[PDB]
Symmetry: none
Subunit: 110 residues, 5 copies
């Protein structure tokens, strides 16, 4: 067989993780007078820290699925839309002091 021997003496291990992976000041504003909106944002962000680790120690790991990590994401969408007639009309006849704002988006970071 296979002997595995590990000797540790007077070691000093330190792992510090600070302010990692935080989410601050996020705004989700879908809409705006649309018809169909499928809103599925997906986050898989991994922030990993490690210090002085070690893996698995197996002897003859054979047969089937051993130490298998499987991840499956299914996001198959089917979106259908039937519209007889769609009109976006801005009808401003006559005369005066008129100011019409439609779908106006403003971003001021400052």
């Amino acid at each position: 067989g296979g002997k595995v021997q590990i000797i540790n003496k007077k070691l000093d291990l330190s792992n510090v993780q600070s302010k990692c992976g935080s989410k601050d000041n996020i705004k989700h504003v879908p809409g705006g007078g649309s018809v169909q909106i499928v809103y599925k944002p997906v986050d898989l962000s991994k922030v990993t820290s490690k210090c002085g680790s070690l893996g698995n120690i197996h002897h003859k790991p054979g047969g089937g699925q051993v130490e298998v990590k499987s991840e499956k994401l299914d996001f198959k969408d089917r979106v259908q839309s039937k519209i007889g007639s769609l009109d976006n009309i801005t009808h401003v006849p006559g005369g005066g002091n008129k100011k019409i704002e439609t779908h106006k988006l403003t971003f001021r970071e400052n």
Copy 2:
């Protein structure tokens, strides 16, 4: 067989995790006069810290599923929409001091 021998003496292990993975100041505002909105944001953010760990120690791990981690997400959507007629009308006749704002979005970070 396979002998596994581990000796530890006078070790010092330290793992510090501070302010990791927090969620602050998140706003979800879907809508806006739409028709169909499927709002499924998905978060899988992993913030892991470790220090001086060790894996599994198995002898002949064979047969079937052994130490198998499986993750499956099913987000299959089926969205259907039937509209005979859709009108977005801004009709401003006559004359005066008129100010019409429709679907106006403002972001001031300052």
Copy 3:
């Protein structure tokens, strides 16, 4: 067989991770009076730090799937749209002091 022998003495291991992988000031604004919007942004950002690690120690790892990491993302979309007639009309007859703004987007970083 295969002997694996490891001797560690008077080591000093340090892993520091600070302010890594954070998400700040993100704005999602889909819409704007559209018809079909499939909004699926996907994030797989990995920020990894390590110090003094070691892998797996296996003896004759043979048969099936051993130490297999599998990731599968399925984002197959099927978007259909049927419109009899789509009109975007800006009809401004007559005479006065008229200011019409449609789909105006402003970004001021400052």
Copy 4:
């Protein structure tokens, strides 16, 4: 067999990761009065730091899939659109003080 022997004495390992992989000030604004928008931006940015690591130590790793890492992304889209008639009309008859702005985008970095 194959003997693997490792001796470490009076080592000093340090791995520092600071402000890596952060996402700040991102704006997603799809729309603008379109018909079909498939919005699937994909991020796979890997920011890795390491110091004094070591790989796997296997003896006769043969048979099937051993230490196999597999990643599969499926983003096959099928977008269909049928429009009988699409008109974008800016009809400004008559006479006055008229200012019409359509799909105006402004970026001021300053």
Copy 5:
């Protein structure tokens, strides 16, 4: 067999990664009154730092797939569009003080 022997004594390893791989001030603005937009930007930017590492130590790694890393991205799109008639008309008859701006984009970096 093949003996692998490694002796380390009084080493000093340091790996510093600072402000690497960050994403700041990104704006995604698709749309503008189009018909079909498939918006799939893909990021695979890898920013790696390492110091004093070592690979795998295998003895007779033969059979099947051993230490195989596989990455597959499938972004096959199928976009179809049928339009009976598409008109972009700017009809400005009569007489006055008229200023019409359509699809005007301005970038001021300053």
